[PDB]
């Protein structure tokens, strides 16, 4: 006789995944966000399904269908705002997870780090694409701007924007193809998340100290289930606070207007989780260089495993690196704020300077600070 928990194949996989998987005891709350992301994935996908059950992707019905969901459908407004604020919370958790990975040297798990970068790319694409679906003024106009950014690509680039648009500009074909891709992509995210978990489970998670915790490992089920339950409950507390008291808080009011291609909005801006890289795009004058900087602003995460030079993996014992990391976080907040604001004086200079400081901190200040760090500790 043998345990069904660790002899049945599905149950054996689940057991080795999150029942009897050894875990560091000193894991802080910063790791809970990982599970939160998974929760914020499922809570998204399910809701999306219900939205897809009352959404008719067409330039003559998209806004009307969304309105019909909001008003007429029994408890449809709650699903819609749940979806929007859940995407926002998903990006909050994603950014916090990336910050944790940077802080505690979690990028030493190279395969997991690269798979996470791919997941992050896919999530940005999914959210950008999904924001088109309500077909508001902001949706259509922002989509036009972002897709037209691909015209800067040399040679083929112009043809590409005709290919993505499904024609001469963003129209019904673009809307329906965006709907289809928005449907398919989250399942690719789920598969990539499974692969990301496999890679991490091969080596095990990293404690805040950075030292290997093989000597002190605790089973996952008795402890790190209820802790993740508490984390998910707190995330739900925040998310339903947003949905039930300030539904259209982060979303721009201009979306609640039929997409009229005869009137440019006063300011065309993406989501708050998109304004930082869009501000980076704004900063560079050259169009092609702008797109290169925009893509590099996220692709630079892959370079992080190579740029690490300090002998300590984590940052608990590197105060100078901690100050640099917080300078980077403040710089990202400045990028978001600048992206919100129009490209005028002095926002132009502030955005440019913060854009340079972003790459300068990531590529230069952190490694040089790490060299000084090693020199300061006899090694």
């Amino acid at each position: 006789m043998t345990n069904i928990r660790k002899s049945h194949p599905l149950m054996k996989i689940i057991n080795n995944a999150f029942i009897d998987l050894p875990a560091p005891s000193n894991i802080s709350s910063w790791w809970n966000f990982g599970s939160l992301l998974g929760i914020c994935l499922i809570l998204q996908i399910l809701t999306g399904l219900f939205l897809a059950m009352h959404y008719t992707s067409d330039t003559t019905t998209a806004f009307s269908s969304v309105t019909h969901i909001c008003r007429d459908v029994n408890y449809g407004w709650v699903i819609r705002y749940l979806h929007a604020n859940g995407a926002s919370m998903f990006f909050i958790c994603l950014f916090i997870h990336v910050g944790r990975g940077l802080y505690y040297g979690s990028y030493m798990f190279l395969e997991t780090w690269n798979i996470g970068v791919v997941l992050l790319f896919t999530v940005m694409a999914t959210a950008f694409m999904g924001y088109v679906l309500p077909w508001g003024q902001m949706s259509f106009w922002g989509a036009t701007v972002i897709t037209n950014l691909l015209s800067a690509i040399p040679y083929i680039g112009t043809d590409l924007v005709e290919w993505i648009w499904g024609g001469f500009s963003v129209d019904k074909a673009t809307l329906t193809r965006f709907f289809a891709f928005h449907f398919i992509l989250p399942f690719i995210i789920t598969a990539l998340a499974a692969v990301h978990l496999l890679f991490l489970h091969e080596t095990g998670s990293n404690n805040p100290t950075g030292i290997s915790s093989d000597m002190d490992k605790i089973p996952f089920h008795p402890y790190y289930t209820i802790k993740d339950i508490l984390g998910a409950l707190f995330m739900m507390l925040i998310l339903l606070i947003l949905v039930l008291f300030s539904p259209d808080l982060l979303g721009d009011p201009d979306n609640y207007t039929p997409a009229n291609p005869l009137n440019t909005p006063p300011h065309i801006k993406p989501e708050w989780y998109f304004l930082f890289a869009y501000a980076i795009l704004r900063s560079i004058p050259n169009k092609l260089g702008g797109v290169l900087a925009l893509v590099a602003s996220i692709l630079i995460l892959i370079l992080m495993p190579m740029l690490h030079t300090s002998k300590q993996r984590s940052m608990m014992f590197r105060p100078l690196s901690q100050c640099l990391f917080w300078m980077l976080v403040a710089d990202l907040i400045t990028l978001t704020w600048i992206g919100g604001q129009p490209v005028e004086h002095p926002f132009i200079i502030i955005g440019q300077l913060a854009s340079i400081l972003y790459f300068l901190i990531i590529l230069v200040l952190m490694p040089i600070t790490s060299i000084i760090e090693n020199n300061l500790l006899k090694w």
């Binding site: 000193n26 030292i211 000597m215 002190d216 300590q312 993996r313 014992f317 590197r318 105060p319 500790l377």
Partner: protein, 98 residues
Amino acid sequence: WLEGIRKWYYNAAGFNKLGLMRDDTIYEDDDVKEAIRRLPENLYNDRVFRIKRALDLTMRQQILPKEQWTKYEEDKFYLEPYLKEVIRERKEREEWAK
């Protein structure tokens, strides 16, 4: 002179509070795990006890009391000779490969 800055940094680092020597904090790459395997029994046992105690402390978020902190002058670089030997052997192998 620089040793004052070094002592200030050691105080501001944090692993002295957790009762960790310097070599307990180094990232475990291939050279480092090989050196750890190369350690003698007594040093390895003290190292693993120190690391386990530190992980306990940061799990509870209680820094170890003031008086028995690892002093600057009492910090011994036990891993350093073994790590230097490992690095030298690896460098010699790479030179032979070239």
